[PDB]
Amino acid sequence: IDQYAVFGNPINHSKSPFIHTLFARQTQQSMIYTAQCVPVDGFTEAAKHFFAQGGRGCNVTVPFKEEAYRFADRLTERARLAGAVNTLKKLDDGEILGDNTDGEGLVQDLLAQQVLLKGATILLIGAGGAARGVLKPLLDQQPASITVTNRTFAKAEQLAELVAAYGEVKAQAFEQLKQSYDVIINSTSASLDGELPAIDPVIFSSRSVCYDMMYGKGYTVFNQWARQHGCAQAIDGLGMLVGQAAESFMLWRGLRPGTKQILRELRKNLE
Amino acid sequence: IDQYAVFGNPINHSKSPFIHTLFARQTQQSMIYTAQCVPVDGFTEAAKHFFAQGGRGCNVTVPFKEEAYRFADRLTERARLAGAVNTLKKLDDGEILGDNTDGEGLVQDLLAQQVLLKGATILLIGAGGAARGVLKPLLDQQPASITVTNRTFAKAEQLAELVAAYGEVKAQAFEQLKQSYDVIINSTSASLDGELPAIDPVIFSSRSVCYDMMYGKGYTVFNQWARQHGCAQAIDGLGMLVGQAAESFMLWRGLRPGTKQILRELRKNLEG
Ligand SMILES: O=C(O)C1=C[C@@H](O)[C@@H](O)[C@H](O)C1
Numbered sequence A: 001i002d003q004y005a006v007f008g009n010p011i012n013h014s015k016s017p018f019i020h021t022l023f024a025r026q027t028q029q030s031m032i033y034t035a036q037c038v039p040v041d042g043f044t045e046a047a048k049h050f051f052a053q054g055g056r057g058c059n060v061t062v063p064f065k066e067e068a069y070r071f072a073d074r075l076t077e078r079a080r081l082a083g084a085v086n087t088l089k090k091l092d093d094g095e096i097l098g099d100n101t102d103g104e105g106l107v108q109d110l111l112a113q114q115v116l117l118k119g120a121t122i123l124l125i126g127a128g129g130a131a132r133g134v135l136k137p138l139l140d141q142q143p144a145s146i147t148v149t150n151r152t153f154a155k156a157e158q159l160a161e162l163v164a165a166y167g168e169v170k171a172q173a174f175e176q177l178k179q180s181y182d183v184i185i186n187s188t189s190a191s192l193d194g195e196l197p198a199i200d201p202v203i204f205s206s207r208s209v210c211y212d213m214m215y216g217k218g219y220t221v222f223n224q225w226a227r228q229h230g231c232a233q234a235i236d237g238l239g240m241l242v243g244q245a246a247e248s249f250m251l252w253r254g255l256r257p258g259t260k261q262i263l264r265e266l267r268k269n270l271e
Numbered sequence B: 001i002d003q004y005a006v007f008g009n010p011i012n013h014s015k016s017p018f019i020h021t022l023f024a025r026q027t028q029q030s031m032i033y034t035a036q037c038v039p040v041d042g043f044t045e046a047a048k049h050f051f052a053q054g055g056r057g058c059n060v061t062v063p064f065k066e067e068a069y070r071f072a073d074r075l076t077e078r079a080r081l082a083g084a085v086n087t088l089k090k091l092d093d094g095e096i097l098g099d100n101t102d103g104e105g106l107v108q109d110l111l112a113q114q115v116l117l118k119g120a121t122i123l124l125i126g127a128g129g130a131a132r133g134v135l136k137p138l139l140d141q142q143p144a145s146i147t148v149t150n151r152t153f154a155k156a157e158q159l160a161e162l163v164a165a166y167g168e169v170k171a172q173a174f175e176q177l178k179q180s181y182d183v184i185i186n187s188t189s190a191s192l193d194g195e196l197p198a199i200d201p202v203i204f205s206s207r208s209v210c211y212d213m214m215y216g217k218g219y220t221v222f223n224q225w226a227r228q229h230g231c232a233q234a235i236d237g238l239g240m241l242v243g244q245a246a247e248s249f250m251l252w253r254g255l256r257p258g259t260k261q262i263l264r265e266l267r268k269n270l271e272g
């Protein structure tokens, strides 16, 4: 029986144990995944220990994603850019591979929701860790362009230039947005507190698809805002959570498990 | 999907999540068992929060067992006698039941290993919480006697007098043990630190069954020592760990899960 886990602090609200348990059963893998809470300043040791005992791989949640990036022996190109690591894996030679599946998890959720990323104009709102982690995977779907925005242009300007080589990535300030986008992606949390970014709603249209990384019962405030202005389809981030898990499972087992039944089940619990 | 957990600090990679998760699979129980960190201010705070948010039960590792004893609204007889709680359960009426499964876990592991406890002469090395927690369940098996021993006499004598009523219990100091015993139980941590108790190996004989509460790859130092003096059977505490887990699981789920396959997998992990 192979050992996997999720390390974070706190862990009582983690859905990964549930999710992975089902992935193992769906793909008939002989593995166990548990949630292990770790002291704020003991991740490295807890980790080195886990692998010492025979740990195959694990997920890293807050607040250890940055320490995980340093703990990894080698990093994947997407973890590289992300600046964080949410997935660890012990290789054959003993090395620990650091990766980041959050962004790819978002990409797969979009595709699962039937959203065409190929040749699309994308507006990414926010420039924090969340936004940073999803740029590369989006660019791999070969969109027409990606527009990054932040309340403070400077930080949005850094991020757009970080991936300028990978494609048409523009950086603009809230005040400069004056056109519609095919896909609007919200990576900011302000909305959970009722706050909306001061952006002209012209960004939304009848052909627009809105994706919010936040999630909850019914629709997120950002999505409701998106529909007040004619947004065609609005998706929350619950699928991103299952998607990132699916990609990690992929990395460890070599098979992408189905996410549809699991998502639908987590959806019930929330409601 | 019921929530259960184990509280430690650390919590240095508890095996309980692994164990209980497997029991769940074998018994097809809809539940998730996690390893929770206990905040510096107290276990009591963790427990409240845990049971407040829908938790149905949890294990408690040292050194929070005494605090769990106070948190419980009701204690089983074995918990009152052990003076510590390793298992909490939220009952249907809202009350939190406090039980202690360590002792029974030991007993079942010994019985699973074909060790006769009824009418046996037992030597319990150590007189701290670990030792105290196994006395009642061992006494229930009706052994001929149980000799509690400790580096410093007084402590062992005090533990013996605490349970004197429940059976033939005597106390002796390390330097006084000059006879063999049918079953020897090591409750100290000396085997983890690499030391043996200052006890003359005469306590071991060809018929002796030696049980060490600590566990690891190969034989524990205490067991190697027992084998040097020809004990008939040396056992480590991995079974006690799984056994106490099984008791708690039953208490919570009303079903008992098997322990041999689980115990065999853990052994495989230990052996590198
Ligand atoms: O709740 C969880 O278990 C997780 C949350 C996110 O940080 C994910 O990025 C992580 O992989 C696992």
Ligand SMILES: O=C(O)C1=C[C@@H](O)[C@@H](O)[C@H](O)C1
Pocket: B006, B014, B015, B016, B059, B060, B061, B062, B086, B087, B102, B244
């Ligand atoms: O390491 C563990 O998970 C445990 C250790 C012992 O204290 C047990 O009494 C406890 O219930 C579980």
